[PDB]
Amino acid sequence: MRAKWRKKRTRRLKRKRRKVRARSK
Amino acid sequence: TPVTLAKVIKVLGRTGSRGGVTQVRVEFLEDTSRTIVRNVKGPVRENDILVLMESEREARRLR
Amino acid sequence: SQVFGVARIYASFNDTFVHVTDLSGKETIARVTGGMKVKADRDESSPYAAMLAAQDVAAKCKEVGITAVHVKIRATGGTRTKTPGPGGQAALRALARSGLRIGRIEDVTPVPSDSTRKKGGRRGRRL
Amino acid sequence: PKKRASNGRNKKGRGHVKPVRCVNCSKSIPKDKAIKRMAIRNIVEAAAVRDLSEASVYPEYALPKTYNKLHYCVSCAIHARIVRVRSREDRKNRAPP
Amino acid sequence: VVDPFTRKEWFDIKAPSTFENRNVGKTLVNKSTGLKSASDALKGRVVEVCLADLQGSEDHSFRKIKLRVDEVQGKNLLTNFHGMDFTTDKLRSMVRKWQTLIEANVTVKTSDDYVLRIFAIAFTRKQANQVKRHSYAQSSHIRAIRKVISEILTKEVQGSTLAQLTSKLIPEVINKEIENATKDIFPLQNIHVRKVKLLKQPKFDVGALMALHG
RNA sequence: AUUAUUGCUCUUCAACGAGGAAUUCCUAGUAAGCGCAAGUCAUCAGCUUGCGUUGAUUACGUCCCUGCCCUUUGUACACACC
RNA sequence: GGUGAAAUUCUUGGAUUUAUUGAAGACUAACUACUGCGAAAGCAUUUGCCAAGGACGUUUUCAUUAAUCAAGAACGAAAGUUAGGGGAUCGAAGAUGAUCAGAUACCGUCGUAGUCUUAACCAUAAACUAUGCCGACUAGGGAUCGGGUGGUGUUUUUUUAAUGACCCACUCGGCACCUUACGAGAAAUCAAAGUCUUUGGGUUCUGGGGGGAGUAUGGUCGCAAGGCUGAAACUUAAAGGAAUUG
Numbered sequence: 001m002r003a004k005w006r007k008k009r010t011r012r013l014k015r016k017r018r019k020v021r022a023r024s025k
Numbered sequence: 026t027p028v029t030l031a032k033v034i035k036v037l038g039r040t041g042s043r044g045g046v047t048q049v050r051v052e053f054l055e056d057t058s059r060t061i062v063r064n065v066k067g068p069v070r071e072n073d074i075l076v077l078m079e080s081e082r083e084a085r086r087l088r
Numbered sequence: 089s090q091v092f093g094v095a096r097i098y099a100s101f102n103d104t105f106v107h108v109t110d111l112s113g114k115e116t117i118a119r120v121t122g123g124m125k126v127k128a129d130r131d132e133s134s135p136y137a138a139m140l141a142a143q144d145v146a147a148k149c150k151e152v153g154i155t156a157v158h159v160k161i162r163a164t165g166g167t168r169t170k171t172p173g174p175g176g177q178a179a180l181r182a183l184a185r186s187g188l189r190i191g192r193i194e195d196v197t198p199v200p201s202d203s204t205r206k207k208g209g210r211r212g213r214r215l
Numbered sequence: 216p217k218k219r220a221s222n223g224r225n226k227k228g229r230g231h232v233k234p235v236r237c238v239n240c241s242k243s244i245p246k247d248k249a250i251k252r253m254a255i256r257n258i259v260e261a262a263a264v265r266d267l268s269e270a271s272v273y274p275e276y277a278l279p280k281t282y283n284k285l286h287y288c289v290s291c292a293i294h295a296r297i298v299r300v301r302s303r304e305d306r307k308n309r310a311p312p
Numbered sequence: 313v314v315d316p317f318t319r320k321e322w323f324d325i326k327a328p329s330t331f332e333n334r335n336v337g338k339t340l341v342n343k344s345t346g347l348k349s350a351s352d353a354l355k356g357r358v359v360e361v362c363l364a365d366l367q368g369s370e371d372h373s374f375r376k377i378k379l380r381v382d383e384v385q386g387k388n389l390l391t392n393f394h395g396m397d398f399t400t401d402k403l404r405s406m407v408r409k410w411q412t413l414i415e416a417n418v419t420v421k422t423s424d425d426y427v428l429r430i431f432a433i434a435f436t437r438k439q440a441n442q443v444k445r446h447s448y449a450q451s452s453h454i455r456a457i458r459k460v461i462s463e464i465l466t467k468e469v470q471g472s473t474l475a476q477l478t479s480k481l482i483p484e485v486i487n488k489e490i491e492n493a494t495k496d497i498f499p500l501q502n503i504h505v506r507k508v509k510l511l512k513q514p515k516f517d518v519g520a521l522m523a524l525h526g
Numbered sequence: 527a528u529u530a531u532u533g534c535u536c537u538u539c540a541a542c543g544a545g546g547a548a549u550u551c552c553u554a555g556u557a558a559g560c561g562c563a564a565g566u567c568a569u570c571a572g573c574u575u576g577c578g579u580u581g582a583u584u585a586c587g588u589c590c591c592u593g594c595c596c597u598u599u600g601u602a603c604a605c606a607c608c
Numbered sequence: 609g610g611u612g613a614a615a616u617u618c619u620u621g622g623a624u625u626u627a628u629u630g631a632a633g634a635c636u637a638a639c640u641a642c643u644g645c646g647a648a649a650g651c652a653u654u655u656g657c658c659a660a661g662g663a664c665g666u667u668u669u670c671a672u673u674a675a676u677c678a679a680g681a682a683c684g685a686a687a688g689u690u691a692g693g694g695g696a697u698c699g700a701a702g703a704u705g706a707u708c709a710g711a712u713a714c715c716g717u718c719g720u721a722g723u724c725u726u727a728a729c730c731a732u733a734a735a736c737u738a739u740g741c742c743g744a745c746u747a748g749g750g751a752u753c754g755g756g757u758g759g760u761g762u763u764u765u766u767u768u769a770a771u772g773a774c775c776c777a778c779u780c781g782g783c784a785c786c787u788u789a790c791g792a793g794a795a796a797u798c799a800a801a802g803u804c805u806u807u808g809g810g811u812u813c814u815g816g817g818g819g820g821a822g823u824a825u826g827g828u829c830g831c832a833a834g835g836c837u838g839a840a841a842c843u844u845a846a847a848g849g850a851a852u853u854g
């Protein structure tokens with residue numbers, strides 16, 4: 001896939017991982 | 026009806042997309058010294074005689 | 089010699105406008121654009137159509153009594169194409185060939201100091 | 216690899232010029248890269264010259280042709296206006312014709 | 313089943329004092345009726361005629377003129393000066409590549425008080441024998457010329473209304489005066505007054521308006 | 527020899543009044559009209575392969591349509607756009 | 609009206625067109641160029657004010673005061689965020705008309721945020737010449753920008769000048785192009801990417817097969833979006849560059 005869509009791909013992914021981890025803070 | 030007679034001076038070449046049309050310069054026999062280029066229909070060689078149904082008009086390129 | 093008025097042909101794409109008015113402009117006469125004389129809706133701007141419209145336009149011109157006219161030719165202009173439409177050339181011819189009179193014509197196409205971003209965005213109209 | 220020393224077109228010692236909109240597709244494009252053409256053509260045309268002076272007043276008048284600049288987007292400049300395409304060394308020719 | 317043509321009144325336009333001919337053209341209004349007659353209704357609209365049609369000479373082919381109507385008497389309506397323009401073809405012509413364009417203007421009043429803004433346009437010219445292909449000015453050059461033209465233009469106006477001003481512009485008096493002061497700076501071909509417009513007119517003053525009529 | 531191989535005689539006397547959109551072939555002894563020999567064949571040519579007879583009109587051109595070649599150009603294809 | 613073609617749409621509410629005149633916000637057309645300037649981002653209407661700069665000129669002044677730079681710091685397109693203003697235009701979103709087998713799109717209509725500005729943030733772009741800075745040396749050519757020098761050059765006439773523009777030759781410093789290549793390179797090409805196995809002028813920075821991955825983790829900056837710093841296990845024989853023929 002296009003580089004810049006792959007960038008936006010993992011950007012989303014990092015936010016959700018950031019999200020989920022906060023539950024356990 | 027003002028009939029006008031003109032003799033073919035030269036064969037310029039084929040116009041028209043299909044190409045069945047020829048560009049030709051002519052000289053009128055009545056009152057010579059002026060030449061107009063006309064678009065023909067049939068086959069044409071030099072020294073033919075074209076009857077121009079209208080004396081002053083001309084054309085150049087066809088599609 | 090004659091009686092003078094203004095022609096003012098607006099020739100765009102997809103239609104063509106020809107309407108004569110009094111030299112002051114406040115009082116006009118006989119519009120009949122090109123979309124009036126045929127409906128294919130794709131043919132509205134055609135040179136053939138503008139001719140037929142220039143026919144009916146020159147008609148009422150004399151039937152009123154303007155015997156002569158000055159033309160101001162016009163395109164869409166503004167932020168638009170700025171180039172004269174197809175049916176403005178036929179129109180001028182067909183209103184000259186009507187036996188009417190012509191003199192001193194110019195271009196009124198609006199041309200900006202440019203501003204006001206053109207439509208279609210940065211990547212252009214793409215098809 | 217790099218296929219032009221001019222890169223796209225005509226910019227050295229500047230780094231930013233300002234964009235113009237293409238007269239066809241309305242695409243933005245830098246002015247240095249623009250591919251510009253002056254359009255100079257009569258208000259009248261091939262056929263309408265005779266029928267003009269005929270029914271017109273004045274002694275042959277003026278005949279003041281229209282002038283405007285044209286800017287193309289290189290997609291449109293290739294699709295219609297001056298493009299063709301050129302061989303490796305035909306590209307290097309900047310001669311107008 | 314109406315046909316306003318069988319209704320509408322007719323008229324004929326009379327030009328101001330000094331150009332060539334005061335006869336201009338015709339117009340259509342309406343019958344003059346009680347409760348919205350033909351008089352106070354329209355009248356004072358404007359007419360744009362080339363002054364070469366007005367003067368008759370073709371060296372004047374450009375330079376359009378605006379004539380605003382003011383008063384009317386007996387199928388005769390007299391007009392006055394609403395402004396002056398240029399033909400698009402001429403300007404689009406005068407502007408050529410490989411050379412510098414210079415414009416300037418000023419807002420200025422007059423005796424009989426008419427406020428107006430006149431413009432000016434001038435292009436640099438090559439000098440005979442010049443080898444280099446462009447001939448551009450020095451931008452210090454440009455500032456000075458703009459100043460001088462501004463200097464010159466401010467003086468010519470405010471002399472005697474637009475009346476003498478009209479008389480001033482027609483045989484290009486200013487155009488040369490520019491050219492005279494200019495030549496000490498840069499060569500400069502063309503140099504016309506291009507546009508002049510009006511914004512604030514004074515009170516009607518029926519008397520002074522008739523000074524141009526006879 | 528019935529579902530009738532072919533031939534002959536009498537009788538029966540259909541559609542078809544020049545064929546919509548489309549589309550084939552062709553430049554001189556050619557096109558088209560016309561029959562004949564040979565192949566096949568015990569019998570069966572409305573087919574084909576050749577043959578001669580009668581014998582035109584119209585081009586003698588172009589790139590508009592269609593087909594294919596050629597450069598130029600781009601390519602991440604080389605089992606090569608299936 | 610709009611398009612390849614159409615349709616949603618607008619039209620007794622006189623649309624589209626014309627005319628006179630007014631309002632609002634944005635932009636700066638043509639002139640505009642292998643032309644200028646700035647550290648870079650970037651900078652094009654006028655005029656006034658405010659401070660700043662390179663090049664040049666220089667028989668002026670100080671006299672090594674410098675080169676380059678981890679840390680640290682100023683500026684930093686577009687979008688985006690906070691709070692006012694502004695909100696003409698074009699227009700992420702959304703809603704529609706169409707096209708399509710489908711069409712969450714391309715084309716058309718409406719149009720929220722936005723686009724502008726003030727006060728604050730944010731620090732990223734193919735932020736590109738994909739090419740560190742200072743110094744030296746090595747080769748030919750005609751244009752052009754700025755400064756300067758040379759003139760019984762041309763043109764401007766007034767009475768010759770003085771000027772101003774222009775011509776020719778030189779010289780500094782510019783933005784670039786042309787031809788060569790001694791030389792260099794894997795080649796494309798390159799007055800540097802040259803003066804490198806005949807390998808050393810000074811100095812800063814980065815890379816060490818491909819994926820995994822700019823991911824995980826810690827720190828830190830941020831209102832947020834996110835920025836900076838930044839691994840491993842595991843997997844894999846290629847991935848990649850330039851050029852040749854198909």
Ligand SMILES: [Mg+2]
Nearest residue numbers: 022023024025
């Ligand atoms: Mg919880």
Ligand SMILES: [Mg+2]
Nearest residue numbers: 214215290294
């Ligand atoms: Mg396309």
Ligand SMILES: [Mg+2]
Nearest residue numbers: 216217218600
């Ligand atoms: Mg490539």
Ligand SMILES: [Mg+2]
Nearest residue numbers: 223224226245
């Ligand atoms: Mg560029």
Ligand SMILES: [Mg+2]
Nearest residue numbers: 229230231735
């Ligand atoms: Mg940049």
Ligand SMILES: [Mg+2]
Nearest residue numbers: 543544545558
């Ligand atoms: Mg038949």
Ligand SMILES: [Mg+2]
Nearest residue numbers: 564566567571
């Ligand atoms: Mg047989």
Ligand SMILES: [Mg+2]
Nearest residue numbers: 566571573574
């Ligand atoms: Mg068979």
Ligand SMILES: [Mg+2]
Nearest residue numbers: 600601852853
């Ligand atoms: Mg290749």
Ligand SMILES: [Mg+2]
Nearest residue numbers: 201636637653
């Ligand atoms: Mg401007």
Ligand SMILES: [Mg+2]
Nearest residue numbers: 695697722723
């Ligand atoms: Mg808005």
Ligand SMILES: [Mg+2]
Nearest residue numbers: 701702703712
């Ligand atoms: Mg949507």
Ligand SMILES: [Mg+2]
Nearest residue numbers: 704705706711
């Ligand atoms: Mg849909």
Ligand SMILES: [Mg+2]
Nearest residue numbers: 701702712713
């Ligand atoms: Mg969607």
Ligand SMILES: [Mg+2]
Nearest residue numbers: 732733734735
């Ligand atoms: Mg970066």
Ligand SMILES: [Mg+2]
Nearest residue numbers: 222223734736
């Ligand atoms: Mg770049």
